[PDB]
């Protein structure tokens, strides 16, 4: 089972700029080379080139709707292709709106996939509930079937077909949810482990339950969309929306190690690393490093250590 | 069930000054306005005016006995009043000696109340055990029935009548207890969860047990006296007595979220925030912010999010 | 049961210098004086004087083999002596290679001892598996019986006789293991709780299991070799090999408080504190302080507090 890194240097999903530098920062830290040290075969598709849609007027409150919709349609095609060839796709963010194309493309090949969303946010605001027209906080809204027709068709997203049900997604790390978003997750019966559930159960029981909930009845492909801000700012400070009281570096790697062990990881998103948002240079390094470590963990790197087979190290 | 904020800008309870600025700092951060966004009805009683008792000579080792006793008697009257009207009182500290008047006044209306004391300290030194004559460190001593007559009557506190039994108080976050205090808690059989119990059980099991212990036999009003230094200095640095190895920001909010869910919160104290004790401006902000978050959590704010009822956000 | 502090100002175990200043740094913080405040009788043996072996040519890849082997043989003699007199030995590190002499000397008196190794590393590389000829990372290799004859006899260590079986050692805090080391621990069936086990079980269940594994069948002397880097760099930054995602300050003290309570602590190592490796002065202080706190914890200091017996503090 091969791995294919796909760079999504896109930031139109939010008002700030910088997140598009995420892929470069991750590559600069040797993400690709390090992944090749794992048991997986790695191919680098490179960074996608996003054609900016000229005169991309706001759709009501939604900002850059056509540009975000275009970039995502292109990502969806790329991901769908690698998924078709039977490889595991790894999208390096810019902003989380790219999860639309990533999950959409993944679903075209594995419609029965489930989603594990690690984030401090639900990113489930609809074009009608957002306070900011930022699409970075609306990904899940365009992806959920139960939300189809709950908001006006946004220009640039007509190609999107709701691919996952509220029952196939599980959030982990929630701690900054808007009223409308909270209304949506409760009304839709979405499974989640906000920081309070993590504190109560412990990351161990949490992963145990998310797997039982998403995989108990049937084993299907796992799509992990990891927003770096799901971890506490003390670990991933270089993000647009840091929120205190986050998952620890350890819980982050625990989540990933467990996902690796299921042997069902099919798609991965490493989003929101903004190299321009560090108070100091080492804060960026610290954020980039942990994102890289999380990715490596997803593909086998265990904290207890790793060693190559058929190798009598003695 | 209405909420009434009562400011206790008092710092005579300790040698340092600055804690009296706590209420102003908390209000400055919008604590009142933010509370109004909750499901609770909020009224601001304002800050009490403390008449300094002139020529307040030390009683043996105890410092400013008359001034601390007076300020507390006044606080006890105010709190007793709001409690009588059926509102939940919220005292914003200065120093923890104000817990004497706050808990005393609370007990006049709900004598069967229990106390959950979140602190790095037991604050149970008597006028005979204290190394420093600081009344900040002696609150529980004046409040416990089992300690009545165990120390000479201190000028200014004759109005105080021990209102809670050793069996009705539970400590959480202990990690800096004097020999005499340790002797007192063990000899009195006081229930506590020091940092070592928290590490062992997890904050989840801890709240589970404190409620079983204090509420298992009978459901009664809960008085939460929260010393900000109960959380690690990395979260609430702006306090007079920081102690490493404290509760985390998350465990702090977990405690509060759980207390809210009992529906029994009757009295609250947010003490020890000293705006003048930050090594930098943002350490004060960090301390004030978390104190405000803890207060909001006590009244409904959940990390998983909140939404208003009878509101089809969609 | 008396305590005897033995300084091991040695750093030849690694390429960098500075760790030999560890003992001085710990003493400078009043470690000795503080220990005397505990219920234990304390004697300071002082710092050993290590005769540098001139012309200490590398043995294949292994650096300073004769000097490290010599220092350890001397330490082994000293520790064996204090152990014989029925005192608990406490070795203040330089580097962890000194665990060879420390554990070897300890074993001469208590051959049935078990080892609890708190470290981010297994330090079990053999002179054949090390990428660096650093003996700081090969301690356990020279100590394990199952590894006897698995590598060429290194000059300076002929005096060493494998004293512990793979079944008598338990690692805690692992998160940076070489492939060969990982191969060795898995092949040898060594018991360990890497950071992932800690995350899964909680430090409480972990100590519970390490004691059940090492003490369930028979109660025997406990030798605690504590590498300061076992705790996260945020707590012990002043070390040669910091690794993110470490044990917290609290889990560190939990481990020690539990070890104390077994009443079986026989030998202690406080290693890797390098005063010259702090990015700032307070990072050293922070590292030194925590090493000192851990040591005091091993000998009785409880976070819930301590008080002297036959002393009516009231
Ligand atoms: Mn987010
Ligand atoms: Mn997100
Ligand atoms: Mn306190
Ligand atoms: Mn207090
Ligand atoms: Mn180490
Ligand atoms: Mn070591």
From Swiss-Prot, chains A, B, C:
UniProt: Mn(2+) 1 binding residues: 96, 119, 123, 227
Tissues where the protein occurs: Detected in liver (at protein level).
UniProt cofactor note: Binds 2 manganese ions per subunit.
Chain spans, region Disordered: 1-22
Assembly notes: Homotrimer. Interacts with CMTM6.
Binding site for Mn(2+) 2: 119, 121, 227, 229
Pathway the protein acts in: Nitrogen metabolism; urea cycle; L-ornithine and urea from L-arginine: step 1/1
Activity regulation comment: Inactivated by diethyl pyrocarbonate (DEPC).
Swiss-Prot/TrEMBL cofactor(s): Mn(2+)
Keyword S-adenosyl-L-methionine attached: no
Gene: Arg1
Family statement: Belongs to the arginase family.
UniProt-recorded name of the protein: Arginase-1
Role: Key element of the urea cycle converting L-arginine to urea and L-ornithine, which is further metabolized into metabolites proline and polyamides that drive collagen synthesis and bioenergetic pathways critical for cell proliferation, respectively; the urea cycle takes place primarily in the liver and, to a lesser extent, in the kidneys. Functions in L-arginine homeostasis in nonhepatic tissues characterized by the competition between nitric oxide synthase (NOS) and arginase for the available intracellular substrate arginine. Arginine metabolism is a critical regulator of innate and adaptive immune responses. Involved in an antimicrobial effector pathway in polymorphonuclear granulocytes (PMN). Upon PMN cell death is liberated from the phagolysosome and depletes arginine in the microenvironment leading to suppressed T cell and natural killer (NK) cell proliferation and cytokine secretion.
Pfam families named in the record: Arginase
Induction, as annotated: By arginine or homoarginine.
GO biological process terms on file: adaptive immune response; arginine catabolic process to ornithine; arginine metabolic process; cellular response to dexamethasone stimulus; cellular response to glucagon stimulus; cellular response to hydrogen peroxide; cellular response to interleukin-4; cellular response to lipopolysaccharide
Enzyme Commission designation: 3.5.3.1
Reaction equation(s) it catalyzes: L-arginine + H2O = urea + L-ornithine
